[PDB]
Amino acid sequence: DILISTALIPGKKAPILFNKEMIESMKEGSVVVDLAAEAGGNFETTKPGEL
Amino acid sequence: VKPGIPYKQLTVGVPKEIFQNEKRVALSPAGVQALVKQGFNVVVESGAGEASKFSDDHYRAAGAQIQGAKEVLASDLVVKVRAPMLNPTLGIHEADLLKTSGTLISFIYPAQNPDLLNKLSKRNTTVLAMDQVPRVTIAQGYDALSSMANIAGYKAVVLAANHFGRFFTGQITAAGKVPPAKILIVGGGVAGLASAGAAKSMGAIVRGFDTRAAALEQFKSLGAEPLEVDLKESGEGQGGYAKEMSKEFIEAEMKLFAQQCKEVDILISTALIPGKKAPILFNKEMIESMKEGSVVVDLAAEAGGNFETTKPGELYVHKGITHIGYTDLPSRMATQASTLYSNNITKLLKAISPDKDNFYFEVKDDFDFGTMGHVIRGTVVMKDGQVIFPAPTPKNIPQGAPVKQKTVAELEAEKAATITPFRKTMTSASVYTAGLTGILGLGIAAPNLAFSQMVTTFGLAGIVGYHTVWGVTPALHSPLMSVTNAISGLTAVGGLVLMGGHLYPSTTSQGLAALATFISSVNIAGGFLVTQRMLDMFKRPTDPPEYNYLYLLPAGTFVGGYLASLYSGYNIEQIMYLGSGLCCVGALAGLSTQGTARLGNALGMIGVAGGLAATLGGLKPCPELLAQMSGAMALGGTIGLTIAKRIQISDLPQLVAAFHSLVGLAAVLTCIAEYIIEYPHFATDAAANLTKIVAYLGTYIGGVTFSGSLVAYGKLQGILKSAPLLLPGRHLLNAGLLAASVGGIIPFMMDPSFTTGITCLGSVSALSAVMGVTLTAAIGGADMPVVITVLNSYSGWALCAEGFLLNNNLLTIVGALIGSSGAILSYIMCVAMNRSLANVILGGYGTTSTAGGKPMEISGTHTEINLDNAIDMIREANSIIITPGYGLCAAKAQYPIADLVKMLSEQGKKVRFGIHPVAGRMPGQLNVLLAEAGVPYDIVLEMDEINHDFPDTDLVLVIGANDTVNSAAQEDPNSIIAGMPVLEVWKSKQVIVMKRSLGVDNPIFYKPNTAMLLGDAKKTCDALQAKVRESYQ
C-alpha cells in the first residue's frame, strides 16, 4: 500500500525505478514517496516541487 | 406466521454527502456485501466515496445498484452517517425528499436535534439512533462513538507529526543523544487510550492522567505514567460518564497540570462532560507555561475544548505554541472510518431484526437491563412520528454490582496465612525430635556392630537416592520405572547364597531359593530389554552415530580383574559391592541429561553383572552346583528375553505391574527359605531376634507387593471391571488386617518352636495378600498410576529388608535407591493433581482444597465447526501448541498427528506439543508414545514451561483431554477438581476440541472462543491428515 523510493546514484542521475502504468497499478489511494527528488527521481512521473 | 415483510422487498439507500467537509462514508463495498447477503436491496448514488477512496464500480460489483439521488433516499431504508438537513444541492430539506415510512439509522442526537425530530415526525418515518446506543456488552459489536474516538485518536497522534520539529522516538547513536519527547494525554476515555497506544508505539514517553479511577488503571496498563493530584476526592462519574467533584480536586489537578506543563511538550486534550461543555483544564497562563515549539491539540473541538484559547477549525500559531484546532480530524481518515462505520452498522443490523427475508424489529418497552430489547428501545427513538427519545431507566440491574469471584490461589494463601509463625517452627522442631529419638531407638535395639554398619550405609544410600532422582529430566520417567525394575531383580543375590546342595536340591529351602532365583532372573533380562528398546526411540535421526559397543572395555576389565583376583588368592567382594552399588547409582544419575541416556543403561548392566559375579564367586561353588545356578538363571533370562520383544510400548504398565509381582514373590520366598535354613542356629546368635523380626517384616512387605501388583495388572488389562468396587465394612476390615499384622509379631517371640514359628510366619503372607486385595480393588482407574508407583516403593523396601537379613551392602544400597525413586514418582504425580495420598488409598472425595458442597454450574453456548473450517482456521496460523491426551495415543491415532507435525513444520509454522504429568497410566508414558510416533523431542514440552508460552500463540489443538484442560480448577472453589494445576489454554484465541458428542462439564466446552468439532479422534484426525496433504500439494 505504501511505496517509498529513495534510490539515487551520487554524481549521476537517479534511475527511474517506477514505470508510467506500474505506478497507477496500485489501488486508488496509493502513496508514492520519491526521496530522490533533488536528483530527479525513481519514477516515470514525478514533478519535484509539489505534491 | 411471522409479520416481517420480505427483505427482497426491503431496499437500503446510500445517498450523497450534503454537509460541508463530509468525507467519511456509511457503507463500503465490503459494507455493501453484507445486508444484501442478509437480504435487503441496495441502491447507491453517484458520488459517495470518491473522497473516501471508494470507487462506485466496487460498490456496483459488490451488490449495490446505481440509482439517482431523489430516489436513493426515498427507499425502504435510507442510510446516512449524519442527520438530514437542508440539502443545498437540491434546495430543500433532506427529509422532504425521502419516502413516508422510511428507515433511519444515522447520527441524530435528538436532544440537540429537536427541530430535526419535528421534521422527521412530519415525514412519519421510523428512526433508530446510532448515537444513543448505550454502553452494553452485547452492544460492543456496534459502538460508533468508541470507534470514532479510536480513529480520531490515531489521526490526532498522526497530526502531532508535521507540527513538532523534533523526532518522536529518539535514539542514542554515535552523533548525539536524541532525547525522547514527553506527551501529555489530558483526559482519558477511549480516545485517550487509543492515542496513548499510538504514541507508545511511536516511542514517546506518555504521562496521561484522568479523573476516572479506571482511566488511571487503563493508562498504567497501556504504560503511561499516571499523574496524581493531592486533593483525593471521590471519583465522580458513575454510570459510564464523568461528573464534577469539588473545586479542591479541580485546583489540585490544575496545579499539577500546570507543573507538568513545564515538563511536557505535547498536549492532547480528550476530556468531555457528557451533555455539557468541555471543562476548562488549560487557562491562558496555564497553556503559556509550556516551552516553545509545543503543540496543544484538543479532541473536544466541537464542544469547545479544555484550553481557554482554541480556534475551532484552524491551525493557529498564537505566539509559538501552535494550538492545533482543526475540527474534523477523523473525517480526514475516511477509509478506515467508513470501514468501521460499515462494521458497526452490520453488527447493529445483525441483531436489529434476525430473520432471513423477514424484518419487524419490534422493540420492548419493558426496560430490562442487559436486554437487547431495552437497548433497541433506546436505539429506536422515533416510530412514524412517535418519539421514543425520552427513555425510562431499566428495571433490572445487569452489570451494576461488583460480585467478582476470588480464586483458589487466594484460599490457599489464606490457609497458609492462618498459621502463626510459632507453629511452623514448632512443627519442624517436633519432626526433628521425633527423628532423633527414632535414631536412638534404632540404636538401643542394636545387637552388634554389623547392624550399625548396615544402618549407616542404608541411610547414606537413601539420601543419594533421594537426591539423584529429582535430577532426571521429566521426559525420561518412563524408562526410569523399567530401570528400577531391572535393578530390582538383584534379589537373585538373595537366592544364590541360599541355593545349595547339588544340581538338584536336597532340602526344601534350597528348592525355595531355586524358585526365587528363577523368577528373579526374569526381571533383569526383561527390564534391560525394555529399557534399551525404549531409549532407542528418543533418538533423532540427525544426531551423530553413538557407538555403544566400546562399553565392554570397563565391564570387561571389571569382571576380568575380579576373576583374576579370584585366581590370585584375593577377596574383593566387599569392594565389588561398592562398585556395583555405585554403578547402579550412576544408572539413574547418568540418565538426567537426555543426551547421555545410553550410558545410564550400560552402567546398570555393568552393575548387575558385577554384583551377580561377585556374589557367585564369594561362596566357592563346586563345579556341579554351578550348573544348576547357570541353568536356572539362563532359563529365567530366556523367558524374560522372549517376552519383552513381542509387546508394543502402549502395553507397558501391564508388564511393569507383572515385574513388581515377581519381585514381591521372590522376596517372600527367600525370606521363608532363609528362616528355614537358619532354625538350628537359634542359640548362639545375638542378632537372632533381630533377623527374626526382619524376616517377619520382609514377609509382610513382599506379600502386599505381590497381591496388589497382580490385582493392579488385572485392573489395567481389562480382566477385572475398572469401576471401584465396594465392600460394606472396609475400614474396620482394613484396620483389622493391619492390627493382625501388628499382633502376629507378639507370639512370634516367646516360643522358638519351629512348628509354631513357621506356621505363624507363613500365616503372614495370607494376611498381606488379603489386605492387598482389599486395598487395591477399591481404588479406581482414573487415578490409577499412583498405585503403580507405590508398589515400586514396596518392592524397593522389600529389597532393603532383604539386605538387612543377609548382611549384604549391595542389596541395601539398591533397595534404598529403588524405594526413594518410587516414592518420588508417587509424590510428583500426587502433586501433579492435588489429592493427597491418604485420600487416594483408603478412599476419599475430591481434592484437598475443595470444601463444603454445591459444585457450581456454568452456562454458555456452543460453537460447531466442520473439517473445512478447521483446516481453514489452521492454514493461517504460525504458532501452534497441541496438548494430546491418552485417548489420542491409546486409540492408535498418534501416527496422523506425527505426520501432520511433519508436514506443517516444513512450511514455516512452529508446532509444539504440551504434556501434562497425569495424561497416561504411567509417569511419562505420553512422551515415549509421542516418540514412538516419530516426533523429535525438541518440540515436546512439559507443563511448567509451556504454561506461560500460551498468550502469544495463534492456535491450540486440544485432542482428547478433559481434566487437564478444565477451567473450573482455577476459578471455582466449589468444584470437584479445584486447585489442580492445569494448562492455561484459554489465553489463546482459537481452540479446536475434538471429542465424541457433548458433555461436571468443562467450561471450555461453552466458552465462546472455543471452536470445537465432532467425531472419533481417529476419524477426525486422519480426515484432517488427508485434507492437510491434499490442501497444500
DSSP letters along B955-979, please?
EEEEES-SGGG-SHHHH-TTSTTTT
Sort out which chain A residues have CB atoms less than 8 A from B48's CB and list them.
none
Q: Is B1016 annotated as a binding residue?
A: yes
**Residue A29 to residue B55, Cβ atoms within 8 A:** no
Per-residue three-class SS string for B351-412: HHCCCCCCECCCCCCCCCCCCHHHHHHHHEEEECCEECCCCCCCCCCCCCCCCCCCCHHHHH
- Annotated binding residues of A, written as ranges, equal 8
Question: A7: distance to nearest CA of chain B, Å?
Answer: 23
B316: Cβ–Cβ under 8 A, 6 or more apart, which residues? B322, B323, B325
Beta strand extents in B159-201 (DSSP E only): 172-173, 176-177, 182-186
Nearest CA among B409, B376, B382, B413 for reference residue B394: B376
Residue B621: what residue type?
Answer: P
Sort out which chain A residues have CB atoms less than 8 A from B55's CB and list them.
28
Task: Nearest chain B residue to A27 by CA: give it.
Answer: B53
3-state secondary structure of B864: strand
DSSP type of residue B651 = G
Task: Nearest chain B residue to A30 by CA: give it.
Answer: B53
Question: A30: distance to nearest CA of chain B, Å?
Answer: 10
| Inter-chain CB pairs, A–B, below 8 Å | 5
**Residue A28 to residue B335, Cβ atoms within 8 A:** no
Q: Which of A1, A2, A27, A28 to mutate to test the interface with B (most CBs of B within 10 A)?
A: A28
Diameter over CA atoms, chain B: 130
Residue B276: what residue type?
Answer: K
Nearest CA among B152, B150, B144, B113 for reference residue B349: B144
Measured between alpha carbons, how far apart are the two ends of chain A, in Å? Answer: 18
- Containing H/E element for B777? helix B765-777
B217: Cβ–Cβ under 8 A, 6 or more apart, which residues? none
Q: Is B961 annotated as a binding residue?
A: yes
Beta strand extents in B291-375 (DSSP E only): 295-298, 322-324
Q: For B898-928, give the DSSP string.
A: HHHHHHHHTTT--EEEE--TTSSSSTTHHHH
Q: Which three cell numbers stand for residue B371?
A: 436486554
Q: Which three cell numbers stand for residue B66?
A: 446505481
Check the CA dihedral B713-B717-B718-B723 and report its sign. Answer: positive
B493: Cβ–Cβ under 8 A, 6 or more apart, which residues? B611, B612, B615, B806, B808, B810, B811
Residue B891: what residue type?
Answer: A
Task: Nearest chain A residue to B55 by CA: give it.
Answer: A28
- Beta bridge partners, B13, equal B43
**Residue B55 to residue A28, Cβ atoms within 8 A:** yes
Phi then psi dihedrals of residue B11, to 5 deg = -125, 120
Beta strand extents in B69-207 (DSSP E only): 86-87, 92-93, 103-106, 126-129, 172-173, 176-177, 182-186, 205-206
Question: A8: distance to nearest CA of chain B, Å?
Answer: 24
3-state secondary structure of B992: strand
Q: Which residue has the cell 441483531?
A: B351
Residue B59: what residue type?
Answer: Y
Sort out which chain A residues have CB atoms less than 8 A from B53's CB and list them.
27-29
B893: Cβ–Cβ under 8 A, 6 or more apart, which residues? B1017, B1018, B1021, B1022
Tally the C-alpha atoms within 13 A of residue B691's C-alpha that lie toward its C-beta.
21
Check the CA dihedral B240-B243-B245-B251 and report its sign. Answer: positive
Sort out which chain A residues have CB atoms less than 8 A from B339's CB and list them.
none
For residue B963, indicate whether it is catalytic. yes
Question: A31: distance to nearest CA of chain B, Å?
Answer: 12
Q: Is B614 annotated as a binding residue?
A: no
- Annotated binding residues of A for NAD(+), written as ranges, equal 8
Given a contact cutoff of 8 angstroms between Cβ atoms, the answer to whether B192 and B216 are in contact is: no
Question: A24: distance to nearest CA of chain B, Å?
Answer: 14
Q: For the range B836-841, what are the long-range contacts, defined as Cβ-Cβ under 8 Å and sequence gap of 24 or more?
A: B837/B786, B837/B790, B840/B779, B840/B783, B840/B786, B840/B787, B841/B775, B841/B779, B841/B787, B841/B790
Given a contact cutoff of 8 angstroms between Cβ atoms, the answer to whether B242 and B212 are in contact is: yes
Distance CA B144, CA B151 (A): 11
- Record the resolution, in angstroms: 3.7
Q: Left (φ > 0), alpha (ψ -120 to 50) or beta: where does B45 sit?
A: beta
Given a contact cutoff of 8 angstroms between Cβ atoms, the answer to whether B660 and B652 are in contact is: no
Check the CA dihedral B1006-B1007-B1009-B1010 and report its sign. Answer: negative
Q: Which three cell numbers stand for residue B284?
A: 491562558
Phi then psi dihedrals of residue B808, to 5 deg = -145, 130
Distance CA B588, CA B481 (A): 10
Task: Nearest chain B residue to A28 by CA: give it.
Answer: B53
Tally the C-alpha atoms within 13 A of residue B666's C-alpha that lie toward its C-beta.
33
Q: Which residue has the cell 454458555?
A: B860
User: How much of chain B is helix, strand and coil, in % rounded to 5?
Assistant: 50, 10, 45
Neighbours of B92 (CB within 10 A): 11
3-state secondary structure of B748: coil
Distance CA B800, CA B405 (A): 51
Nearest CA among B791, B764, B755 for reference residue B697: B764
Q: Is B772 annotated as a binding residue?
A: no
Neighbours of B4 (CB within 10 A): 16
Q: Which three cell numbers stand for residue B529?
A: 530389554
Question: B199: distance to nearest CA of chain A, Å?
Answer: 21
* Candidate list B963, B972, B1001, B1022, residue with the active-site label: B963
Within B807-906, where are the H helices? 809-830, 837-841, 867-874, 886-889, 895-905
Sort out which chain A residues have CB atoms less than 8 A from B335's CB and list them.
29
B104: Cβ–Cβ under 8 A, 6 or more apart, which residues? B78, B120, B125, B126, B127, B128, B382
Sort out which chain B residues have CB atoms less than 8 A from A29's CB and list them.
53, 335
Beta strand extents in B1-64 (DSSP E only): 11-14, 41-44
- Beta bridge partners, B880, equal B911, B955
Phi then psi dihedrals of residue B371, to 5 deg = -75, 145
Q: For the range B113-116, what are the long-range contacts, defined as Cβ-Cβ under 8 Å and sequence gap of 24 or more?
A: B113/B83, B116/B83, B116/B84, B116/B85
Q: For the range B586-591, what are the long-range contacts, defined as Cβ-Cβ under 8 Å and sequence gap of 24 or more?
A: B587/B483, B587/B487, B588/B465, B588/B468, B588/B469, B588/B472, B588/B480, B588/B483, B588/B484, B588/B817, B588/B821, B589/B468, B589/B471, B591/B472, B591/B476, B591/B479, B591/B480, B591/B483
Q: Which residues of A touch B (CB under 8 A)?
A: 27-29
Sort out which chain B residues have CB atoms less than 8 A from A27's CB and list them.
53
Per-residue three-class SS string for chain A: CEEEECCCCCCCCCCCCCCCCCCCCCCCCCEEEECCCCCCCCCCCCCCCCC
Distance CA B656, CA B658 (A): 5
Q: Is B964 annotated as a binding residue?
A: yes
B303: Cβ–Cβ under 8 A, 6 or more apart, which residues? B272, B276, B277, B278
Integer angstrom CA distances of residue B1003 from B138, B163, B860, B987: 20, 52, 8, 14
Sort out which chain A residues have CB atoms less than 8 A from B158's CB and list them.
none
Distance of alpha carbon B576 from the chain centroid: 49
Residue B39: what residue type?
Answer: G
Q: For the range B654-657, what are the long-range contacts, defined as Cβ-Cβ under 8 Å and sequence gap of 24 or more?
A: B654/B713, B654/B716, B654/B717, B655/B526, B655/B530, B656/B481, B656/B482, B656/B485, B656/B788, B656/B922, B657/B709, B657/B710, B657/B712, B657/B713, B657/B716, B657/B788, B657/B791
Question: A34: distance to nearest CA of chain B, Å?
Answer: 18
- Beta bridge partners, B62, equal none
Antiparallel, parallel or unpaired: β B182-186 and A2-5: unpaired
Q: Which residue has the cell 437540491?
A: B90
Distance CA B545, CA B523 (A): 30
Q: Which three cell numbers stand for residue B550?
A: 566400546
B853: Cβ–Cβ under 8 A, 6 or more apart, which residues? B974
Given a contact cutoff of 8 angstroms between Cβ atoms, the answer to whether B514 and B628 are in contact is: yes
Burial of B420 (0-12, 13-18, 19+ CB in 10 A): exposed
Sort out which chain B residues have CB atoms less than 8 A from A28's CB and list them.
53, 55
- Containing H/E element for B8? none
Task: Nearest chain A residue to B334 by CA: give it.
Answer: A29
Nearest CA among B462, B434, B487 for reference residue B609: B487
Nearest CA among B941, B943, B947 for reference residue B984: B947
A25: Cβ–Cβ under 8 A, 6 or more apart, which residues? none
Integer angstrom CA distances of residue B555 from A24, B464, B617: 80, 23, 16
Q: Which residues of B touch A (CB under 8 A)?
A: 53, 55, 335
Neighbours of B172 (CB within 10 A): 9
3-state secondary structure of B285: helix
Integer angstrom CA distances of residue B1015 from B196, B477, B919, B962, B1009: 47, 32, 21, 16, 20
Given a contact cutoff of 8 angstroms between Cβ atoms, the answer to whether B1004 and B970 are in contact is: no
Q: Is B922 annotated as a binding residue?
A: yes
Integer angstrom CA distances of residue B807 from B497, B866, B1013: 11, 68, 63
Task: Nearest chain A residue to B58 by CA: give it.
Answer: A28
DSSP type of residue B6 = P
Beta strand extents in B15-109 (DSSP E only): 41-44, 65-66, 86-87, 92-93, 103-106
Q: Which of B53, B58, B339 to mutate to test the interface with A (most CBs of A within 10 A)?
A: B53
The experimental method is: cryo-EM
Distance CA B153, CA B1023 (A): 48
Check the CA dihedral B655-B660-B663-B668 and report its sign. Answer: negative
Sheet holding B955-959, edge to edge: B940-941, B911-914, B880-884, B955-959, B990-995, B1013-1014
Within B469-598, where are the H helices? 477-487, 492-496, 508-535, 552-566, 573-589
Task: Nearest chain A residue to B335 by CA: give it.
Answer: A29
Given a contact cutoff of 8 angstroms between Cβ atoms, the answer to whether B209 and B226 are in contact is: yes
Distance CA B897, CA B935 (A): 9
